[PDB]
Ligand binder design. Structure first.
Ligand code: 13M
Length: 258
């Protein structure tokens, strides 16, 4: 029954997220964006509407694309959350709170799947932007990217697959210590259930690493810190860059988070 639960989560993940580790890897083994010329060419083909004006600064244009991917992932994560035992039975306000505080942690966790030490896939697997090009961007835009790569490199070293990641993301969403929850007790039990499944699955899927579970619990805490830091950086950008507008949805997610 618990082995069945793990599969249900895995199937929901495969059905709700446009990208997964297997697909990402097939592609990585795509138009390359390594400089301004290639960035511009990529934009004209992939996000034509965004460069038809005559346009925002390259850094802001990239920042907008990053935001748009987040908005899309929020929709994917919301639909995914339904296959998690008990989630749909939670109060509507609790579901919203869980999604609000968990989306960015899940985003950076899953972002690792399309990242390697040299760069990352973008625009639904149709592009590959170099890590070095992202580092080249002027401050503070170049500071948004690198920390995510740093986390990704160590996360990817854990060699998790989609069956593991699906449960990890589920566990991230099922967090009882999120601010403003109405029914903390039911959420903690829901959490305990998912974490229990995650533990048994890692034991079965990774007999070679007896520290995998504790390692992942730590990544959960690392993600929370990574997000707090990301939120601060986004705030700095929002105030000091008069041309970088924040998407309304993300603005709502960011509100009173940290
Ligand atoms: C504003 C940051 C964002 C979170 C965030 C932080 C980091 C990060 O990759 C390091 C991504 C995902 N970032 C991306 O997916 C991404 C990056 C850079 C791009 C550069 C050129 C692009 C041209 C055409 C299409 C796309 C689509 C996505 C895309 C690009 C482009 C998202 C948020 O806070 O919502």
């Amino acid at each position: 029954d618990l082995k069945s639960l793990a599969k249900r989560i895995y199937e929901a993940y495969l059905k709700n997220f446009n990208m997964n580790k297997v697909k990402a890897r097939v592609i990585l083994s795509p138009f390359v964006i390594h400089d301004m010329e290639t960035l511009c060419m990529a934009e004209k083909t992939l996000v034509a509407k965004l460069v038809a004006n005559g346009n925002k600064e390259a850094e802001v244009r990239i920042f907008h694309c990053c935001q748009c991917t987040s908005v899309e992932t929020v929709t994917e994560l919301t639909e995914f959350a339904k296959a998690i035992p008990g989630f749909a039975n939670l109060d509507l306000n609790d579901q919203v709170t869980l999604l609000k505080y968990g989306v960015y942690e899940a985003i950076f966790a899953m972002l690792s799947s399309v990242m390697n030490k040299d760069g990352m896939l973008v625009a639904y697997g149709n592009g590959f932007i170099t890590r070095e090009f992202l580092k080249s961007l002027r401050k503070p835009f170049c500071d948004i990217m690198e920390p995510k790569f740093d986390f990704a490199m160590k996360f990817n070293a854990l060699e998790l697959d989609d069956s593991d990641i699906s449960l990890f993301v589920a566990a991230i969403i099922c967090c009882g210590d999120r601010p403003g929850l109405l029914n903390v007790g039911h959420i903690e039990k829901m959490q305990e259930g998912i974490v229990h499944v995650l533990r048994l699955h890692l034991q079965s899927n990774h007999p070679d690493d007896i520290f995998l579970f504790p390692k992942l619990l730590q990544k959960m805490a690392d993600l929370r810190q990574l997000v707090t830091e990301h939120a601060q950086l986004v705030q700095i950008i929002k105030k000091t860059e008069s041309d970088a507008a924040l998407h309304p949805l993300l603005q709502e997610i960011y509100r009173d988070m940290y």
